[PDB]
């Protein structure tokens, strides 16, 4: 019924451009009202840790790193928690690590028991370095600080997605971490295969199994492509789990944008979210 009525409301009614422009107004207001601030991200000791000057994590929901803290390590990383459907910390949306934030990225993974990492960008995008390789090659393990990262096996989930089985070691404890990377999803755009994107989410959920640990989700800035993944996964859970009878995609995206800046970056990605959700409900 609830999924059904959602499509009815869609059919009763392609703008949408109006709705997303209203999402932008709400964002600008949260910043005017100081309900979303970027104080920790602007600190002079943290600025170099931001990939982009215009993308800072909100103080209210930022990931706070306490691991190695006794050693004098900063609590800071450009990343935010996003709440899941049950109200728990389901996602961590973070930027593509820089050469000097690789260690912080692994502190994050380690401290929060992360099992699955979703990557929605490439290392090199427009002739530009967009993300550092943080995973291991079969042929070179990766070392930052006290962590040793090791590639066990690689395969393709499908033509667009690489599934890497990683081992990470820290102080004699060992954990498996899975990374799924989506290869052909540009910036401000949409993936080449909405179906493959769904499969990525499907596989991430299988690998995640039970357990309260959040999915780690990133792209280059940790905004547009990251926010689309989180939103897709969030709405899938709603369905598998609980779709409200007044269910609104406008409210979901608003909620996301309140936790991670510009989560869902462009009108095009917003329309894409609608097409995807609509398809998902038909089945």
């Amino acid at each position: 019924d609830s999924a059904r009525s959602f499509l009815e409301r869609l059919e009763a009614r392609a703008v949408l451009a109006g709705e997303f422009s209203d999402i932008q107004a709400c964002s600008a207001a949260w910043k005017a009202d100081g309900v979303c601030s970027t104080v920790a991200g602007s600190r002079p000791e943290n600025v170099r840790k931001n990939r982009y000057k215009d993308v800072l994590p909100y103080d209210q929901t930022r990931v706070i790193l306490s691991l190695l803290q006794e050693e004098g390590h900063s609590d800071y990383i450009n990343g935010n928690f996003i709440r899941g459907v049950d109200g728990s910390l389901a996602y961590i949306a973070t930027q593509g690590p820089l050469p000097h934030t690789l260690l912080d990225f692994w502190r994050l993974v380690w401290e929060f028991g992360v099992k699955v990492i979703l990557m929605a960008c490439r290392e090199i995008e427009n002739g530009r370095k967009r993300c550092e390789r943080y995973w291991a090659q079969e042929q070179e393990p990766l070392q930052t600080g006290l962590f040793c990262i090791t590639l066990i096996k690689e395969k393709w989930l499908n033509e667009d997605i690489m599934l890497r089985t990683l081992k990470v070691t820290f102080q004699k404890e060992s954990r498996s971490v899975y990374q799924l990377q989506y290869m052909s999803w540009p910036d401000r755009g949409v993936p080449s295969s909405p179906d493959h994107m769904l499969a990525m989410v499907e596989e991430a959920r299988r690998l995640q199994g039970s357990g309260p640990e959040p999915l780690c989700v990133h792209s280059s800035a940790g905004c547009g492509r990251t926010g689309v993944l989180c939103t897709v996964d969030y709405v899938r859970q709603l369905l598998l789990t609980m779709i409200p009878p007044d269910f609104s995609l406008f409210d979901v995206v608003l909620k996301m944008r309140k936790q991670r800046p510009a989560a869902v970056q462009t009108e095009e990605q917003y329309r894409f979210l609608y097409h995807t959700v609509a398809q998902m409900f038909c089945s």
Binding site: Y52, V55, A221
Partner: peptide, 6 residues
């Protein structure tokens, strides 16, 4: 190569 979005 400095700025992403807004």
């Amino acid at each position: 190569l400095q700025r992403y979005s807004e």
